Each structure stands twice: as structure tokens, then as C-alpha cells.
């Protein structure tokens, strides 16, 4: 779809199997996700935002479908303010900014 | 134009006289600005993201061109890592994400 900006760029992602909201963030290099729990193996990381930075768990080749567009990639799973959906999956899914 | 999600949508902006590299930031509900030395009246705001809140300063009425489109609203600026063009500056250049 086309999708003006007068609202909150919120849409429904399907991950681990569940339904979830999230935001399409051109602003966010990477994907994270709320605590949830997750199958597939996972590594510790960090990654840094306006605010500072978190301990995320880094999940690898996951499955994800996003406003029933399909990408696999790499989800950041802790303690973020909003569920977020970066450019390593907007790209898979084709979108871009126009204007 | 297009601009693709493979790098960061980083774009020349103006504000206060000044030149400036900022993201095009769908993720973002308002316009953030490194720190700088803005001229008049402004209203202390604090915004949260991943890593916690910073403390802004919000200006009202600020115009700001945006790879040649000109803007005017509202801007905080604060000690933010990255200049963010958010959705209330988005809209007045017309951009959408498209997939
Ligand atoms: C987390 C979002 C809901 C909100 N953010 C916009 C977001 O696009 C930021 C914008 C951003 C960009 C660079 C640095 C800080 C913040 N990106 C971000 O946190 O991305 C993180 C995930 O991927 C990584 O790539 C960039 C940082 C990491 S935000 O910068 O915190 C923000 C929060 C509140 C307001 N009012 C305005 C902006
Ligand atoms: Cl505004």
C-alpha cells in the first residue's frame, strides 16, 4: 500500500506464530521487538536509540510477516518503548520513501 | 523522489541558517535537532525512545527545508544523536512509504 503520515505508520506483524502491533520506523537500521518469547537460538547484544542503549536478545533468520508482506531477518528482542519494524526488513518487503 | 531503504534515508535540511544531513524517520511523531543555538521562546519536553528520554527544547513556528521543500512547525533540539525529520514535517512535503 501507499501510506500517508498524518498517523502513526502501525501496522499487524505475525512473529513466533503471534499477532502483534508494530510501527514501520525508516529512521531504525534494525528490528526490535517487545519481550516475548521467541523459538530459535539467540545471542546477547546491545544496540542504542535516542536515549542510551539496551541488552537485547539477537534472533537470527526469523520468520516475519508485516502487513501480510513476508521477510526473514534478524529481530532484536528487549526492552524497547514500541515494537519496531527497521530498514533490514522494510527492504525485504520493497518499501521505500517517496515524496 | 524515491529514496530506498538500503542506507539510511539521509537528506540535506536547513534550519536557523544552517545546513544539516537528517533522516526522513516515519518512526518518529516529531522533528528532532542536534543541539544548536536557535533563536526565541521555546518550552522545555522530554521524549522517550530506546535507552530512556532526553531533555529538548520545543520551538514552535521553526521553517526548515527539507531536501528543497519547505516546512515549518515544530522542532525539538536537544542532545540527540541523529537529526530526525518526524511525521509532523513529513506530511507538509507530501512524503509516503510505499511497499
Ligand atoms: C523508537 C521509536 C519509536 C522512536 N524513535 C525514532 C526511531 O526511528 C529512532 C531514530 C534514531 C536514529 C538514530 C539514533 C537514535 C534514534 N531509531 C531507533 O531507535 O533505531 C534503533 C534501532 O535501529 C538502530 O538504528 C538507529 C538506532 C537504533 S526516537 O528517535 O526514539 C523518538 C522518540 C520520541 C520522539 N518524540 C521523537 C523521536
Ligand atoms: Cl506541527
Redesign the pocket.
Known amino acids: 500500500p501507499q501510506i500517508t503520515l498524518w498517523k502513526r505508520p502501525l501496522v499487524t506483524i505475525k512473529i513466533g506464530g503471534q499477532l502483534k502491533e508494530a510501527?514501520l520506523?525508516t529512521?531504525?537500521?534494525?528490528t526490535?521487538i517487545e519481550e516475548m518469547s521467541l523459538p530459535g537460538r539467540w545471542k546477547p547484544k546491545m544496540?542504542?536509540?535516542?536515549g542510551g542503549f539496551i541488552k537485547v536478545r539477537q534472533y537470527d533468520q526469523i520468520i516475519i510477516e508485516i502487513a501480510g508482506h513476508k521477510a526473514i531477518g534478524t529481530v532484536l528482542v528487549g526492552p524497547?518503548?514500541?515494537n519496531?519494524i527497521?530498514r533490514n526488513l522494510l527492504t525485504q518487503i520493497g518499501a521505500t520513501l517517496n515524496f
Open positions: 510501527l520506523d529512521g531504525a537500521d534494525d526490535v544496540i542504542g536509540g535516542i524497547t518503548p514500541a519496531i527497521g
